[PDB]
Design a binder for this molecule. Structure first.
Ligand code: MG
Ligand code: MG
Ligand code: MG
Ligand code: MG
Ligand code: MG
Ligand code: MG
Ligand code: MG
Ligand code: MG
Ligand code: MG
Ligand code: MG
Ligand code: MG
Ligand code: MG
Ligand code: MG
Ligand code: MG
Ligand code: MG
Ligand code: MG
Ligand code: MG
Ligand code: MG
Ligand code: MG
Ligand code: MG
Ligand code: MG
Ligand code: MG
Ligand code: MG
Ligand code: MG
Ligand code: MG
Ligand code: MG
Ligand code: MG
Ligand code: MG
Ligand code: MG
Ligand code: MG
Ligand code: MG
Ligand code: MG
Ligand code: MG
Ligand code: MG
Ligand code: MG
Ligand code: MG
Ligand code: MG
Ligand code: MG
Ligand code: MG
Ligand code: MG
Ligand code: MG
Ligand code: MG
Ligand code: MG
Ligand code: MG
Ligand code: MG
Ligand code: MG
Ligand code: MG
Ligand code: MG
Ligand code: MG
Ligand code: MG
Ligand code: MG
Ligand code: MG
Ligand code: MG
Ligand code: MG
Ligand code: MG
Ligand code: MG
Ligand code: MG
Ligand code: MG
Ligand code: MG
Ligand code: MG
Ligand code: MG
Ligand code: MG
Ligand code: MG
Ligand code: MG
Ligand code: MG
Ligand code: MG
Ligand code: MG
Ligand code: MG
Ligand code: MG
Ligand code: MG
Ligand code: MG
Ligand code: MG
Ligand code: MG
Ligand code: MG
Ligand code: MG
Ligand code: MG
Ligand code: MG
Ligand code: MG
Ligand code: MG
Ligand code: MG
Ligand code: MG
Ligand code: MG
Ligand code: MG
Ligand code: MG
Ligand code: MG
Ligand code: MG
Ligand code: MG
Ligand code: MG
Ligand code: MG
Ligand code: MG
Ligand code: MG
Ligand code: MG
Ligand code: MG
Ligand code: MG
Ligand code: MG
Ligand code: MG
Ligand code: MG
Ligand code: MG
Ligand code: MG
Ligand code: MG
Ligand code: MG
Ligand code: MG
Ligand code: MG
Ligand code: MG
Ligand code: MG
Ligand code: MG
Ligand code: MG
Ligand code: MG
Ligand code: MG
Ligand code: MG
Ligand code: MG
Ligand code: MG
Ligand code: MG
Ligand code: MG
Ligand code: MG
Ligand code: MG
Ligand code: MG
Ligand code: MG
Ligand code: MG
Ligand code: MG
Ligand code: MG
Ligand code: MG
Ligand code: MG
Ligand code: MG
Ligand code: MG
Ligand code: MG
Ligand code: MG
Ligand code: MG
Ligand code: MG
Ligand code: MG
Ligand code: MG
Ligand code: MG
Ligand code: MG
Ligand code: MG
Ligand code: MG
Ligand code: MG
Lengths: 137, 122, 52, 71, 117, 204
RNA sequence: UAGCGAAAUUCCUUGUCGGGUAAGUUCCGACCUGCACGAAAAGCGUAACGACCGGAGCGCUGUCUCGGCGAGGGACCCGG
RNA sequence: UGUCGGCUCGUCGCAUCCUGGGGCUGAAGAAGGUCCCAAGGGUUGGGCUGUUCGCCCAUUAAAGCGGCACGCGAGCUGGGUUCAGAACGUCGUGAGACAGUUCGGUCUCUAUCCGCCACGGGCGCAGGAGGCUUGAGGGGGGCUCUUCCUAGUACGAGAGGACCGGAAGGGACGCACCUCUGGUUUCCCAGCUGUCCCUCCAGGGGCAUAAGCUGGGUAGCCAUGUGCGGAAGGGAUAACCGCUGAAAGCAUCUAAGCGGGAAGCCCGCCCCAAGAUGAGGCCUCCCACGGCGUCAAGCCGGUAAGGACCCGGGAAGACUACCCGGUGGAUGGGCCGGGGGUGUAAGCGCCGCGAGGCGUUGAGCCGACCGGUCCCAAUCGUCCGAGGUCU
């Protein structure tokens, strides 16, 4: 009975590792399996990461964006079977965890407040185009 | 959540700008109202010589809430502010072009007339 | 002196009755490894000592 | 009378713990016309009811003499 | 209701905190200390941590124990005599023992926080 | 009338076909039959179902004889299930099929000596104008001389919770026999470790 | 008389009309039918000034929908 | 014998506002009128006024009436009324007066008894002891709207628009739960200020609350969040519909008898429960007196099964009780792994005059959650406890 953990982790066979890295302070777009009137589609959602709530399974994350004058946020179950493809577009400096403070000043300052994490930027573009040539030959 | 005495913005061009919820139209004694619901409200201000003037008691349907809406598929979505659209007893917008995103919930309520004019059907 | 006021002088019979469970309960002691002195359970003792 | 609703209630103003309980301030209303008249100066309901009604009568009268002569 | 949390303490944050630190300083000074049953039990956990943290070495760990114990000479001793003595004695670096005495006046149950050996 | 014991192990959420569903996780290990009481031997039909293993030394009680009476490893706990004499010598999670709805009884968390407001979710009292004496206070309780007393069972503060609570019509989600696990529709009484029973609901 | 006037004065009275509000026995403008103003027990008015009394709006908020959690001093247990 | 209204908590009545059923209709259908049956449950938010009352806005299935000292001030409020001040109209020569107005105006920490909500101690239960139970009796719960399908059919000139049977969704309310969303999380982590100190720099503590301020936060508790409940169904019955049917050759639902028929009643569901002294039942364990009592009625030291004390400790808990563990051991505490929170420690190196910046680095630190390991601590021992009446 000393498996209180693993037990919860057994039904947790709904896991998914087809999902890149992304720490708060970097914009990212996700194609969600959104059902239209009756059919199914993949409405793209393009925004920055605000919250990341880690709790083993069901560990969700939030994404807020500007839309025609209004700001809209969305919380996504990380290992949700409806996250077709979560694509990274640009990473930046964190210096925070839950950065709701962007709500306050969502302007050209929010850009100079959220820098460009050249650290991960390099590691990303490099490891990408570097391991590509390896998978080639 | 939207209750009486609540100020909502106007996502359409009905001329209205801000309206205070007079009441939530639902069960005998509702308590709140979120995206998709319809509420009796009063215009607390409107564009000069608009289609609807200050003090007009109209019925409107929520389009955006500050309180995130839960999705059956575990998903969640929250807006920056609370707004709606002045409707007809025919449950159709008194105005046309309705700028500003909406919600997919409006779809299961028969307000497709809205969603068609709503650019960002999020 | 305020609202809370006893109505009647509690009969001396009821008083004692009240203090029924009021009686004490003798302490608990056991013989010790050192002397024959009676140490309280799970405890050391003066003029006795201990180990480890 | 069948169209005159009579309502009673606690008077308003001084009257010690009397007025507080001893209500009986009369107030009538002509349902079809929606014109009510009230009175709470006397210490007795009936005394007021008489006023209230008779007053209403006077009101309606002039309202009838109004249109009647208006025509 | 809500003791689902960890342990228990009296006084107020600042106080109880300084309390632990004080009983720590005093403890590492004499080794065998007498106090109340609870104060001991809690103090037990607190001290062991400092000892095991001292079991380490890096000056960071040092400066870390310098947040609780202030006396540089005292902490110095910890990284010299105290820690080594308990080498390879992972966990339970101290001992708690019930005393038969009872503080007069308040009837307090005394005890002992002994540095195992 | 299906019936099997188990304990609440925790709860997360799964994904049905393309929708999210919060579910609770129970553990229905093998429950050895101990005493199939017939109406002849008693007056009602039922079955004593054991549970967790035991240090044979702790069960030195006459329980030893009761266990040996059916010849079984000394379990820890055992209760009855009215109107239910199945088969074999042990019940399992195989009893429930993904789709059947079940009733689960548990022991609610004890909220100790809870206040009226907390207990029966009352209204309380004015936080502003009114005297800082009756914020969370039942206020009135009775009338004048008539009746002069208090209606028995009048909702008052006090020790509340930690009792027998039965939740109903929880649909059986994915059941994995591979580990004696069982998934249900989430909201289940009792903490993470309480002994609960799972029976057959009454839809019709 | 001037002036003021359902008034710190208007019983009928939530007078009537206009304004403010979704809705206003209160509030403001106005008429006069002043139960019961009115010229030094002063009349009408008035910048500024009140911990003075009334109405509205903005801002904001556990006042409220409606409550939840947390801290400490009591309460509670033991010794005096 | 504290007096309005308000708040809080309600409970009862039925002359029923709603939902339930039913008769008649000047009842086509829809909708309605009126009368009968029927409290089980429900019976909104707001503007104005001290108000009750009422008027009004928006809605509603409906926004019921009344009793309980027009329920409730040892539960609260104090706007009203009901002292002293003051004022206007006002009557009085006046002092003063006004169910005539206006402004202000001290509601008293300790519950003995009954009663009510919770919890324990004692005895009892004609052997002792452990586990599981029976359900007498009682408590809880009883609401409802909306779209569509049947079918735009029956009905109807038309506009409209059914019964019945079925499905789906929503409100309010109840119970329970932390997965998710959301909250708190008093030292979990970090940033920041003034200052005093350690130790000059770096680094670091106290204090600015009872956290100094701020950014964020697991477990826990929790609602805004999640699940589930009202029901089905059996039985009897209400007003009522009807049968056979005489009195009374006809007639009649009744006078014998019989059937159908309510959100109501009984049962069913859920919770308590043999102090059900009418003390129930089941399964299992231990068993003789060893001595006085001639009898009857009892006592005594030791025992058995088994329990208690003490100790570590708990989502259990004021206390006590409840629950597991107590070396034949993972009970807590420490240590290690993990989950989790924060968000690149310290030190050193590099760049820049410098504040700082870069790397070392998802680093360091790290409460409660999940699990492991005997380093610390549950060492040791004590008391109790049928030996079971008569026919
Ligand atoms: Mg899978
Ligand atoms: Mg995926
Ligand atoms: Mg620019
Ligand atoms: Mg205007
Ligand atoms: Mg429509
Ligand atoms: Mg469109
Ligand atoms: Mg468009
Ligand atoms: Mg005596
Ligand atoms: Mg005694
Ligand atoms: Mg008077
Ligand atoms: Mg009265
Ligand atoms: Mg009277
Ligand atoms: Mg009288
Ligand atoms: Mg008079
Ligand atoms: Mg507690
Ligand atoms: Mg401090
Ligand atoms: Mg610790
Ligand atoms: Mg609680
Ligand atoms: Mg609560
Ligand atoms: Mg509650
Ligand atoms: Mg209630
Ligand atoms: Mg309230
Ligand atoms: Mg007060
Ligand atoms: Mg006071
Ligand atoms: Mg007081
Ligand atoms: Mg009273
Ligand atoms: Mg005027
Ligand atoms: Mg008047
Ligand atoms: Mg008026
Ligand atoms: Mg006029
Ligand atoms: Mg007017
Ligand atoms: Mg007007
Ligand atoms: Mg207007
Ligand atoms: Mg207003
Ligand atoms: Mg008006
Ligand atoms: Mg004129
Ligand atoms: Mg005069
Ligand atoms: Mg004058
Ligand atoms: Mg004069
Ligand atoms: Mg004069
Ligand atoms: Mg003047
Ligand atoms: Mg002036
Ligand atoms: Mg002055
Ligand atoms: Mg003044
Ligand atoms: Mg409050
Ligand atoms: Mg608390
Ligand atoms: Mg507190
Ligand atoms: Mg406290
Ligand atoms: Mg004392
Ligand atoms: Mg209530
Ligand atoms: Mg009917
Ligand atoms: Mg009818
Ligand atoms: Mg018909
Ligand atoms: Mg017709
Ligand atoms: Mg009832
Ligand atoms: Mg109100
Ligand atoms: Mg108001
Ligand atoms: Mg107002
Ligand atoms: Mg008012
Ligand atoms: Mg009022
Ligand atoms: Mg009126
Ligand atoms: Mg209306
Ligand atoms: Mg009543
Ligand atoms: Mg009264
Ligand atoms: Mg009262
Ligand atoms: Mg009072
Ligand atoms: Mg009162
Ligand atoms: Mg009283
Ligand atoms: Mg006052
Ligand atoms: Mg007043
Ligand atoms: Mg007054
Ligand atoms: Mg005079
Ligand atoms: Mg006043
Ligand atoms: Mg006053
Ligand atoms: Mg005091
Ligand atoms: Mg008492
Ligand atoms: Mg009884
Ligand atoms: Mg019963
Ligand atoms: Mg047709
Ligand atoms: Mg046709
Ligand atoms: Mg036709
Ligand atoms: Mg025809
Ligand atoms: Mg036809
Ligand atoms: Mg049509
Ligand atoms: Mg019909
Ligand atoms: Mg729907
Ligand atoms: Mg939670
Ligand atoms: Mg949470
Ligand atoms: Mg800290
Ligand atoms: Mg701090
Ligand atoms: Mg400092
Ligand atoms: Mg100092
Ligand atoms: Mg530095
Ligand atoms: Mg310095
Ligand atoms: Mg200091
Ligand atoms: Mg100092
Ligand atoms: Mg500090
Ligand atoms: Mg100071
Ligand atoms: Mg201080
Ligand atoms: Mg903080
Ligand atoms: Mg926060
Ligand atoms: Mg939390
Ligand atoms: Mg609490
Ligand atoms: Mg709720
Ligand atoms: Mg129903
Ligand atoms: Mg429902
Ligand atoms: Mg039925
Ligand atoms: Mg017939
Ligand atoms: Mg015949
Ligand atoms: Mg016949
Ligand atoms: Mg007939
Ligand atoms: Mg007859
Ligand atoms: Mg029925
Ligand atoms: Mg029925
Ligand atoms: Mg019953
Ligand atoms: Mg003998
Ligand atoms: Mg005998
Ligand atoms: Mg014991
Ligand atoms: Mg034990
Ligand atoms: Mg032992
Ligand atoms: Mg352990
Ligand atoms: Mg442990
Ligand atoms: Mg521990
Ligand atoms: Mg993490
Ligand atoms: Mg760095
Ligand atoms: Mg370098
Ligand atoms: Mg530079
Ligand atoms: Mg520097
Ligand atoms: Mg720290
Ligand atoms: Mg860790
Ligand atoms: Mg050991
Ligand atoms: Mg070791
Ligand atoms: Mg003995
Ligand atoms: Mg004996
Ligand atoms: Mg014999
Ligand atoms: Mg015989």
């Amino acid at each position: 009975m000393n498996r209180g953990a693993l037990i919860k982790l057994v039904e947790s066979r709904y896991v998914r590792t087809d999902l890149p890295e992304f720490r708060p302070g970097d914009t990212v777009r996700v194609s969600y399996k959104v059902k239209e009137g009756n059919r199914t589609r993949i409405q793209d959602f393009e925004g920055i990461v605000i919250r990341i709530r880690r709790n083993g399974f069901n560990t969700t994350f939030t994404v807020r964006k500007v839309s025609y004058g209004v700001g809209v946020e969305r919380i996504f179950p990380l290992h949700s079977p409806l996250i077709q493809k979560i694509d990274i577009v640009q990473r930046g400096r964190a210096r925070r965890a839950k950065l709701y403070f962007i709500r306050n000043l969502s302007d050209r300052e929010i850009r100079r407040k959220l820098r460009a994490d050249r650290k991960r930027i390099d590691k990303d573009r490099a490891a990408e185009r570097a391991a590509k040539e390896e998978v080639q030959k | 959540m939207i209750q009486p005495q609540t100020y909502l913005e106007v996502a359409d061009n009905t001329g209205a700008r801000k309206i205070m919820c007079i009441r939530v139209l639902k069960g005998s004694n509702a308590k709140y109202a979120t995206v998709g619901d319809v509420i009796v409200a009063s215009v607390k201000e409107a564009i000069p010589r608009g289609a609807v003037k200050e003090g007009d008691v109209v019925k409107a349907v929520v389009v955006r809430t500050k309180k995130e809406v839960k999705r059956p598929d575990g998903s969640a979505i929250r807006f920056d502010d609370n707004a709606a659209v002045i409707i007809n007893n025919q449950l159709e917008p008194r105005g046309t072009r309705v700028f500003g995103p909406v919600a997919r919930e409006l779809r299961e309520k028969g307000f497709m007339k809205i969603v068609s004019l709503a650019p960002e059907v999020l | 002196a305020k609202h809370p006021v006893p109505k009647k002088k509690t009969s001396k019979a009821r008083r004692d009755a009240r203090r029924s469970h009021h009686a004490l309960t003798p302490p608990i002691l056991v013989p010790c490894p050192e002397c024959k002195a009676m140490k309280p359970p799970h405890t050391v003792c003066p003029e006795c000592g201990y180990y480890a | 009378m069948d169209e005159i609703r009579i309502d009673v209630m606690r008077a308003s103003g001084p009257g010690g713990q009397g007025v507080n309980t001893t209500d009986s301030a009369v107030r009538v209303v002509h349902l079809p016309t929606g014109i009510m008249v009230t009175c709470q100066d006397s210490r007795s309901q009936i005394k007021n009811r008489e006023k209230a009604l008779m007053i209403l009568r006077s009101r309606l009268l002039e309202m009838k003499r109004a249109e009647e002569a208006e025509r | 209701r809500h003791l689902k949390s960890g342990r228990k303490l009296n006084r107020h944050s600042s106080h109880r905190l300084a309390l632990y630190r004080n009983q720590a300083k005093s403890l590492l000074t004499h080794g065998r200390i007498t106090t109340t049953v609870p104060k001991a039990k809690e103090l037990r956990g607190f001290v062991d941590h400092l000892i095991h943290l001292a079991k380490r070495g890096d000056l960071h760990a040092r400066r870390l124990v310098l947040r609780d114990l202030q006396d540089v000479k005292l902490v110095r001793k910890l990284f010299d005599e105290i820690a080594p003595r308990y080498r390879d004695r992972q966990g339970g670096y101290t001992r708690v023992l019930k005393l038969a005495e009872r503080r007069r006046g308040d009837g307090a149950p005394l005890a002992l926080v002994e540095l195992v050996e | 009338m299906k019936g099997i014991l188990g304990v609440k192990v925790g709860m997360t959420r799964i994904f049905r076909d393309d929708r999210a569903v919060p579910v609770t996780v129970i553990l229905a290990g093998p429950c050895p039959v101990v005493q199939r009481r017939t109406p002849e031997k008693d007056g009602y039909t039922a079955v004593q179902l054991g549970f967790l293993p035991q240090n044979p030394k702790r069960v030195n009680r006459p329980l030893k004889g009761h266990f040996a009476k059916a010849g079984v490893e000394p379990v820890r706990i055992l209760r009855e299930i009215r109107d239910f004499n199945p088969e074999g010598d042990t019940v399992t999670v195989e009893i429930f099929k993904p789709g059947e709805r079940v009733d689960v009884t548990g022991t609610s968390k004890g909220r100790g000596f809870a206040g009226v407001m907390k207990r029966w979710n009352f209204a309380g009292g004015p936080d502003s104008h009114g005297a800082h004496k009756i914020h969370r206070h039942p206020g009135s309780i009775g009338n004048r001389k008539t009746p002069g007393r208090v209606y028995k069972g009048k909702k008052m503060a006090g020790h509340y919770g930690a009792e027998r609570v039965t939740v109903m019509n929880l649909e059986v989600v994915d059941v994995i026999p591979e580990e004696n696990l069982l998934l249900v529709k989430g909201a289940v009484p009792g903490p993470n470790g309480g002994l609960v029973i799972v029976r057959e609901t009454k839809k019709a």
